[PDB]
Write a protein that binds this DNA or RNA. Structure first.
Lengths: 74, 159, 437, 177, 50
RNA sequence: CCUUCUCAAACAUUCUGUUUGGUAGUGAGUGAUACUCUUUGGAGUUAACUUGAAAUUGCCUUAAA
RNA sequence: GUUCUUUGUAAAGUGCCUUCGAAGAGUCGAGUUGUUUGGGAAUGCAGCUCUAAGUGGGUGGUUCCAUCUAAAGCUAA
RNA sequence: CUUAGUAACGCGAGUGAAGCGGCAAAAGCUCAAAUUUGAAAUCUGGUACCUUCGGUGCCCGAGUUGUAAUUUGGAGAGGG
């Protein structure tokens, strides 16, 4: 590899700001509601159905969990 | 209704604070085309027959202002509340808050453009100020903070 | 003996002459011939006793004997516990190779990973790297040509073990080849674990060679520089030596003090060896002045009869700094007072000081009286590009040294206030530093 | 650069802010005609990377097409036919509706002296680039033609018509092989 | 801390070079008898208008 | 949201030397022991230092409409 | 070739040392309904419910490796 | 041209490619993305002249919701 590159933390900062300002999509809202009430076992199925890729569903679930942790723990 | 990010604007500064801010900004009007042209012609004439300090002006370019922010160089930022592509300015208040740079929302982009010899200026920010106005700049920053962050602490809430 | 009595190449001899050292030291005289012969050697030579050049010269001789292109292999690898030691060794190598045509580089923790990877890909025949980043570069960087490791030397194995890189050292030994690799090492002392590490690395039977009040001031991070400047101004006409944790910071401070119209002398590894020796001799024989020096530079360097010893920055070797005062008091006609600057978050060092049980005194200063040159410094930095760049480089070096300090329990980057440090350096806006916080 | 923030924000098209903006802008557009002049694009981040320049000679148009030939290609053809003197450069999606889909199209006026004297953009003035959307030379047109490098487009690498001529032509030389 | 270091260029700490280029261009134009200096324009207009 | 009491003479006229006059202030707080004073109650003087212009009560009409 | 102009602390190229170091979203993709091929992995194209990440993604052969960096455009033979 | 009437499909009738190899010709580049901010330095149009497929001075407007320098990973940029 010669051009894979890294985030440099600028893309990270911009993406975090965009995630905070934009809010949560209705499907994202349902996913977080299921996580906070049902759990991963129920949220991952919905994520896969909405997306169709298991890896993408797992990544979205992890992102939602991180957002919930950053929000409720402050 | 509108989401919390929308309606954050339109909660502008009061009459007195906005008037004071515009009065301060009017002391740093960037030289227009004619003024710069005449200054350059005078300099050329002086050079023809045979050390100034850094000029002070208000930074207003949207890209330029955004570049100034996120580097903590900017001290005051003015944001227009009537930008037709709202997406160009939705992120500015939150970015300024994250960076800690004081910011304010003023009524009308044409008002910002007038103080910078432009038809419409999306934003207007100050980076460096003269020592004489440094105390005035700090006082205006404190007044803006008190009247915006505390008075409108709920601006980011209640849709 | 002298360097002229050895089979040294013409460029190497010219570089040695440029250094200004013509008489071989005892450790050098005892280690250079065996090293040239290729026999593995380990010893307990004290730091700063010239062993660095002692084992660097054989490496350059081997490189000049092989005469392989930079793309061919990686040549020599040097491992040092601390970033400052790596910088000093790289400076010495560059000074020696000025005449030589071979390539050299560094791999320092907290530095630009992409730049180091590019340099390694280009090919480095004399690499000095800390084990922590050396392991990462060996493992997660394609194109590395470490397969051609011809020699390997370890400096200050005891410090490396103490820091906690013993597992890293074992991993490096496992990864690196051992067919044609000649292994050596040097350190101030050697423990049982160090002996085991040497046995693991050193392939053959290695050759063995052997040869006051603790005044401190608690000051804010922002006001430390102003307090030091006031102390220097009011202590003029005396002799003072200031210890720092970065050569770039020392250079920036010396330049700033010179610009503020007060004579000051600098003593850092980045300075030329001839210039370094000339400045040291001038300071020793002047009887009046202020010397700004790095910890590694003065680690083994002679200490003249100086009135003050100021440890402005946290010591690179806490044990050595703690034990120095006992010998320093005896080695000077007038017992030189020891001064140390401690951040309020750095009070943990008081625990180690008490453990030492040496006499201590807490000096105090009034906040009302201070140099009050913050505005002038800020204006000068904002107006002068060279001074701004030097200050930024010094701040970056200081932050990097702080992040790499072994005593993590006492020194932590998180507890530091970046805004106050930047203000002390004269930057209202703290410049970004790639610190793994 | 503010463009990065806008590009990142545009990704979350399902966000509350963008969800509200979609309905507001679609309601505003429905009042106007099918094709109308746009003072400036509503998505500067996409337009700038799509060759848009804030200078005289660049024209941005908004066109409405009924939801289900690709819709983008149909919109480009519709805008080009009305604006014959203009040249279609590219297009992008801006909004959608249950009954209509909205796209913003960028056009360049080759007649303007600014474009003619601009080396970076004077190439469009060549007559070969007349009615690019009609011949499917735009980004959407090329995509609809399946012109790409890879085994995925080997059977349609150079169109679906020249292959018939290639395979149905009996090549004969002066000296038979 | 900011986002990107981006070491500052010398032009920020140095007088503008574009302004110097424009001044030199105006000097060349004046030397070539192409641009009338403002003082010369004022002198000519003072005689004129009467 | 206005700006701040930017010099007057006699001699000498070496083109500036001698003498005189004109200077009534943001507040609060901390603080190093001498001057007198009237006898009592403190009235004026005397080192030094912090401050976001900070602060909780000493018994005439055209900058018109 | 002949020349008149050059202009200014102006521009460009190489090696070394230091500090930084940004890549195209209703887009890929999945689902579904039609078209195309003699194409077995309908690839490709067409309507639409859905719609992602940046040490990431696509294309392949093997429990890892090989190549490239799509969602922008110009170019005579 | 060859691969080749081969792979593949239909497994009948028939349809039917592509890498490699040789030949003809070979030129690579232009944007987006990181601040010129110690000076929108960019450009359309009108006017007076000249050495007119255009050039200069002036004027007006477009542009700061981005026209002027550099760069497309083959990297690239700020300094010595």
């Amino acid at each position: 590899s010669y051009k894979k590159g890294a985030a440099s933390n600028r893309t990270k900062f911009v993406r975090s700001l965009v995630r905070e300002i934009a809010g949560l999509s209705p499907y994202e809202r349902r996913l977080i509601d299921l996580i906070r009430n049902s759990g991963e076992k129920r949220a991952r199925k919905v994520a896969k159905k909405r997306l169709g890729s298991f890896t993408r569903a797992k990544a979205k679930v992890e992102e939602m969990n991180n957002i919930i942790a950053a929000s409720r723990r402050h | 209704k509108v989401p919390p990010t929308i309606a954050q604007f339109q909660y502008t500064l009061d009459r007195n604070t906005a008037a004071e801010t515009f009065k301060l900004f009017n002391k740093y009007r960037p030289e227009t085309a004619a003024e710069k042209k005449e200054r350059l012609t005078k300099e050329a004439a002086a050079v023809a027959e045979g050390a100034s300090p850094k000029p002070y002006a208000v930074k207003y370019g949207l890209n330029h202002v955004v570049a100034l922010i996120e580097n903590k160089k900017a001290k005051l930022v003015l944001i227009a509340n009537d930008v037709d592509p709202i997406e160009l300015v939705v992120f500015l208040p939150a970015l300024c808050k994250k960076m800690g740079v004081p910011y304010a929302i003023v009524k009308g982009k044409a008002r910002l453009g007038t103080l910078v010899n432009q038809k419409t200026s999306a934003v207007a920010a100050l980076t460096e100020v003269r020592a004489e106005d440094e105390a005035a700049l700090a006082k205006l920053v404190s007044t803006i903070d008190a009247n915006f962050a505390d008075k409108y602490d709920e601006v980011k809430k209640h849709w | 003996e002298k360097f002229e009595e050895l089979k040294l190449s013409q460029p190497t001899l010219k570089a040695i002459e440029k250094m200004g050292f013509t008489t071989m030291t005892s450790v050098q005289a005892r280690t250079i011939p065996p090293l040239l012969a290729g026999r593995d050697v380990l010893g307990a030579a004290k730091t700063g006793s010239g062993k660095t050049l002692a084992f660097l010269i054989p490496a350059i001789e081997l490189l000049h004997s092989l005469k392989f292109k930079p793309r061919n292999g990686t040549g020599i690898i040097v491992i040092t516990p601390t970033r400052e030691l790596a910088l000093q060794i790289f400076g010495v190598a560059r000074e020696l190779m000025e005449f030589h045509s071979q390539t050299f580089g560094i791999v320092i923790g907290g530095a630009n990973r992409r730049q180091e990877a590019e340099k390694l890909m280009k090919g480095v025949n004399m690499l000095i790297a800390t084990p922590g980043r050396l392991l990462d570069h060996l493992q997660n960087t394609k194109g590395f040509v470490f397969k051609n490791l011809k020699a390997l030397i370890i400096d200050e194995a005891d410090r490396i073990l103490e820091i906690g890189f013993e597992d890293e050292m074992r991993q490096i030994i496992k990864i690196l080849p051992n067919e044609d690799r000649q292994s050596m090492l040097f350190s101030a002392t050697q423990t049982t674990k160090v002996e085991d590490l040497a046995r693991i690395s050193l392939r053959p039977g290695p050759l063995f060679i052997n040869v006051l009040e603790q005044g401190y001031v608690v000051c804010d991070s922002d006001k430390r520089f102003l307090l030091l400047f006031s102390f220097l101004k009011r202590n003029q006409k005396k002799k003072i030596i200031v210890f720092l944790s970065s050569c770039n910071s020392v250079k920036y401070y010396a330049e700033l003090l010179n610009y503020i119209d007060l004579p000051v002398l600098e003593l850092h590894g980045k300075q030329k060896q001839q210039k370094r020796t000339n400045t040291f001799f001038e300071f020793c024989n002047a009887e009046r002045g202020i010397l700004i020096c790095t910890d590694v530079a003065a680690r083994g360097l002679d200490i003249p009869a100086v009135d003050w010893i100021i440890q402005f920055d946290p010591p690179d070797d806490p044990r050595d700094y703690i034990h120095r005062v006992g010998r320093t008091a005896r080695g000077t006609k007038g017992k030189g007072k020891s001064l140390m600057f401690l951040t309020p978050n750095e009070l943990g060092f008081l625990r180690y000081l008490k453990a030492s049980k040496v006499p201590l005194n807490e000096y105090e200063f009034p906040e009302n009286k201070i140099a009050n040159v913050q505005s002038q410094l800020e204006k000068l930095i904002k107006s002068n590009y060279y001074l701004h760049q030097t200050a930024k480089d010094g701040y970056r070096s200081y932050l990097q040294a702080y992040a790499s300090h072994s005593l993590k329990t006492v020194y932590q980057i998180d507890k530091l206030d970046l805004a106050k440090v930047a203000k002390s350096y004269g930057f209202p806006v703290p410049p970004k530093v790639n610190i793994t916080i | 650069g503010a463009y990065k923030y806008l590009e990142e924000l545009q990704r979350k098209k399902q966000s509350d802010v963008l969800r509200f903006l979609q309905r507001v802008r679609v309601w505003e557009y429905r009042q106007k005609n099918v094709i109308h002049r746009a003072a400036r694009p509503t998505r500067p981040d996409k337009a700038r990377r799509l060759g848009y320049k804030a200078k005289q000679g660049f024209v941005i148009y908004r066109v409405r097409v009924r939801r289900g030939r690709s819709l983008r290609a149909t919109a480009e053809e519709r805008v080009g036919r009305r604006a014959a003197n203009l040249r279609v450069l590219n297009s992008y999606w801006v909004n959608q509706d249950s009954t209509y889909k909205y796209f913003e199209v960028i056009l360049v006026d080759p007649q303007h002296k600014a474009i003619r004297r601009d080396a970076r953009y004077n190439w469009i003035c060549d007559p070969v680039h007349k009615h690019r959307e009609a011949r499917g030379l735009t980004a959407t047109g090329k995509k609809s033609r399946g012109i790409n490098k890879g085994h995925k487009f080997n059977n349609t690498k150079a169109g679906r018509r020249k292959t018939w001529k290639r395979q149905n032509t009996l090549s004969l030389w002066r000296y038979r092989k | 801390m900011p986002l990107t270091a981006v070491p500052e260029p010398k032009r920020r700490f140095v007088p503008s070079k574009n302004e110097a280029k424009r001044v030199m261009k105006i000097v060349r134009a004046i030397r070539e008898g192409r641009i009338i200096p403002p003082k010369k324009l004022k002198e000519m207009k003072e005689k004129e208008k009467i």
